[PDB]
Amino acid sequence: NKKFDRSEHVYRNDSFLELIKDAVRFFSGTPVHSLPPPERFQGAGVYALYYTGHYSLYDEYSRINRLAYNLPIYVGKAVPAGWRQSRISDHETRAGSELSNRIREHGRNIAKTSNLDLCDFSCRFVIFEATGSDMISTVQAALIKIYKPLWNTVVDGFGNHTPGAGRFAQAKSDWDVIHPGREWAEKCTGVHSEPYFIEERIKQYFSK
Amino acid sequence: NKKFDRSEHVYRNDSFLELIKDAVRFFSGTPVHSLPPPERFQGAGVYALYYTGHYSLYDEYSRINRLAYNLPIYVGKAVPAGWRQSRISDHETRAGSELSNRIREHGRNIAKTSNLDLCDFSCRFVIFEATGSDMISTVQAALIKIYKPLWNTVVDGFGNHTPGAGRFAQAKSDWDVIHPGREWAEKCTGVHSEPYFIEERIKQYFSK
């Protein structure tokens, strides 16, 4: 006899959406640092990378980001391996220095390229700590959706590591073709994209 | 030269904690239904099971839950297999009928036991839909922390499925010893806990 009405069981997303936007605004007001920042620190969380230099493909950023760090070229997260399943949802006291280490690592990948200068990059980051560490993937995904950062949405590959012995069959990523060279990328020998079409995709990113 | 201060990068968890508690209060006010509810429905989300009968181990619930459905015996979540990694963070349009199906399934596991009557069980559930589906694991974990439901924290096993061919080496779960019998549990033939010590753990649950 009891009446069933699905909509009476549906959680309304409005406050959660307001909270995510507040988290983005908190993110935006945090200190911009050099890439990598001047000190190591503990914590997991979310980071953005900004470009303000004049490498020709990217030199529009020197205008977009002339007056404020507005537009990231890249957004990522760093969490301890304990929160990635193998197998668990979240297992341990505290999670060490993933964010700092992941940022420093981007800094060395960039220092390895010839056509990019580390001095043209800055970074913002937010540490999410206890229960708030549940927000990390949501804030990373909201920034990617708001900003559509070039190295997340158009030119893939920046965040990848060595593929793993005998999986050097696939091609190198669009990021490695226009930014040689990490040693490991020289190995791929699939047919990678052509610089030209990567460049046309970049130019497209910037006209809309 | 630029000053580094970690605490300037730390997200404050207070609003997020308020939001989780609001989500729990929303959960608590939703309609209580029979187990399983009178209709199937679409959605992923979070559910709780309540007991109000007189099976002797559990008959304290008939008092705790005499006037209101206050204390769950079990809390779980149901999400599509697409959000569990294999491999992706979240991949597809909408996620079908995991919650309804997971609840119905608990209902049949219970109907298979001799000493439990389906008529002494009720359930509440909340569907989290688009961006709110990010809250599912957080709300499930908050309910487990607030209520410490017996079949989550003391008597393990209710939510398990058949182990998988030649992994019938481990013992049956505490739930299967005091609630025979799902066919598959008869197979384990490790040394399972003794009913007595399970019962003493239950009795302990209820004196504190």
CB neighbourhood size of B54 (10 A): 12
CB proximity list for A179: less than 8 A, separation 6 or greater? A113, A115, A116
Q: How far apart are CA B44 and CA B159, in angstroms?
A: 16
The answer to whether B171 touches B188, Cβ cutoff 8 Å, is yes
Q: Is B80 exposed, middle or buried (0-12, 13-18, 19+ CB in 10 A)?
A: middle
Domain parsing of chain B, residue ranges: 1-208
Give the side-chain half-sphere CA count within 13 A for A180. 9
Q: How far apart are CA B183 and CA B204, in angstroms?
A: 29
Give me the phi and psi of B65, to 5 degrees please: -105, 25
Strand, helix or coil at A127?
strand
Q: Is B48 exposed, middle or buried (0-12, 13-18, 19+ CB in 10 A)?
A: buried
Tokens of residue A154, six digits:
């158009």
Strand, helix or coil at A186?
helix
- Name every chain B residue with its beta carbon within 8 A of the beta carbon of A134: 16, 137-138
In the A/B pair of chains, how many CB contacts fall below 8 A? 118
Interior angle at CA B134, CA B39 and CA A15, nearest 5 = 90
Q: Which long-range contacts (CB under 8 A, 24 or more apart) does A59-67 make?
A: A60/A206
Give the side-chain half-sphere CA count within 13 A for A89. 10
Q: How far apart are CA B47 and CA B77, in angstroms?
A: 6
CA terminus-to-terminus distance, chain A: 56
CB proximity list for B15: less than 8 A, separation 6 or greater? A19, A22
The answer to whether B136 touches A13, Cβ cutoff 8 Å, is no
**Of B74, B166, B81, whose CA–CA distance to B122 is shortest?**
B74
Solved using: X-ray
Q: How far apart are CA A124 and CA A37, in angstroms?
A: 9
Strand, helix or coil at B148?
coil
Which residues in B16-73 belong to E strands, given as ranges?
A: 33-34, 45-51
Report the residue of B1, B3, B14, B16 to disrupt the A interface, i.e. the one with the largest count of A CBs within 10 Å: B16
Q: How far apart are CA A38 and CA B9, in angstroms?
A: 14
Expressed in percent and rounded to 5, the helix, strand and coil fractions of chain B are 45, 10, 45
Helix (H) or strand (E) holding A126: strand A121-127
DSSP A35-102: SS-SS-----EEEEEEE-S--GGGTHHHHHTSSS----SEEEEE--TTTS-SS-SS-SS---SHHHHH
- Name every chain B residue with its beta carbon within 8 A of the beta carbon of A125: 9
Kind of pairing between the strands at A121-127 and B74-78? unpaired
Tokens of residue B101, six digits:
């199906």
- Name every chain A residue with its beta carbon within 8 A of the beta carbon of B125: 9
Helix (H) or strand (E) holding B83: none
Resolution of the entry in angstroms: 2.3
User: For chain B, what is the total number of helices (H) and then of strands (E)?
Assistant: 7, 4
Give me the phi and psi of B168, to 5 degrees please: -95, 50
